[PDB]
């Protein structure tokens, strides 16, 4: 997804960035399509949640203790699924 | 300053909506879903100072108990006030009696297994957000 | 420009607000009007001070589009009769007062602010708002 | 560097076709856009582009526009100057629909934002073709 179609639809900065990040989950080991939809969902995430607020960097930031089972550098399309499952737990059963 | 460190569970609270629902369950409350709803409401809201925390449980506590009351049929404060002069003359072995037939010991029971419950399940779970859960449901049935 | 974006912060709560009483049906709502004030409010300024300006002129603003929006009699009514309801012993007033407010809907808005509070922190309400906004929009056009 | 502020200006003709206020000619603005595509190197062209565009975008616009031409106006124009203060603020009240302009500020706010993340002059270009495409079958 170099695809001619994201330079022709997205602005120069915009797109470099992108770029950036799918190359860095191909050199991870990330299939084409697990990429892609990392991407996505990170789009995603980027547009629905505050990722500039302090919880979310201290949560960003406890990536590895909070979601061990999550390779933040190889997604996979089910990560959605495994964060959701994984958040639930940690809001509920988890203290100690 | 994030407002976040303020954000205190329900604590001792959760146990009182615990009651409460195991009542609705049994058909001894009348649950106003949106009133209670406001009181866990008032109850979460984020308090810097912990004067205010202090305030608050204050606060809370009459609150909380007329909540309790209202949800009840229990006759209101004035109806015991104006029948209150006749319940002056009866006999305190009638009194007795009367407390013995009106409190049932299987639901005191009841509460004391759910405190231990809570006292147990709190050490493992977060209570509140069942509590929480429960409660925007009601309130959604109450709504559909 | 990206940089000057700040979301619709307090005012967020505010069409939270409105929405709940359109649902209701205590509010006609406008919904070409709402989106213009929507927009104003989200327009990049680089300046601070601008954003000050703003905040002053969104309030009246404000205020003014949410009377607007309600069935409430406009300004010239009520000052007009107002001259009727100086008359009104103060137990009079305190009843009507306590006729017309709903303690349930204070308190329900009271726990739209504080979910709004809990949630503004784990997601962008402003996204949210911005999307029925449009969808109210749309729906009036079809 | 596309349209820059030009994208702006076909979203608010699109719109009003959309409103039926305007009668859309699209081989002209088809032109009019091929011309502002037109690939220049230097700053100082790019701004004599602007220049010369606004004049030409305006004309078109008006063209477009069911507005009595120019020369209806002066020809019409000394009867106006006969109407007094509150009569022009009348007629004008009545001829500026007020949830027309918000739209077009929303429009142009909307705009703002989306020009930040997505290419709005592919868009622009594809309605146009679209349009032009509707026009011949």
Not at chain 1, 52 to 71: D, G, V
Not at chain 1, 73 to 78: A, Y
Not at chain 2, 93 to 110: C, E, K, P, S
Request: with cysteine; net charge positive.
């Amino acid at each position: 997804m170099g695809s001619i179609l994201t330079r022709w639809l997205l602005i120069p900065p915009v797109n470099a960035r992108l770029i950036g990040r799918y190359r860095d989950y191909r050199r991870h080991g990330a299939s084409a399509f697990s990429a892609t939809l990392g991407c996505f969902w990170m789009i995603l995430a980027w547009i629905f949640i505050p990722l500039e607020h302090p919880r979310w960097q201290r949560i960003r930031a406890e990536h590895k203790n909070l979601y061990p089972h999550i390779n933040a550098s190889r997604p996979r399309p089910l990560d959605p699924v495994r964060y959701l499952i994984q958040t639930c737990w940690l809001l509920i059963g988890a203290s100690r | 300053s994030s407002l976040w460190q303020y954000w205190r569970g329900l604590s001792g609270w959760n146990f009182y909506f615990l009651v409460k629902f195991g009542l609705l369950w049994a058909g001894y409350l009348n649950f106003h879903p949106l009133l209670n709803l406001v009181f866990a409401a008032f109850l979460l809201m984020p308090l810097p100072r912990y004067s205010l925390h202090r305030l608050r449980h204050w606060i809370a506590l009459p609150i909380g108990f007329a909540l309790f009351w209202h949800d009840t049929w229990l006759p209101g404060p004035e109806s015991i006030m104006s029948q209150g002069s006749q319940v002056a003359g009866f006999s305190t072995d009638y009194l007795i009696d009367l407390v013995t037939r009106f409190i049932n010991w299987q639901m005191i029971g009841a509460i004391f297994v759910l405190l231990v419950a809570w006292l147990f399940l709190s050490q493992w779970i977060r209570i509140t957000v069942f509590v929480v859960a429960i409660l925007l449901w009601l309130n959604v049935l109450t709504l559909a």
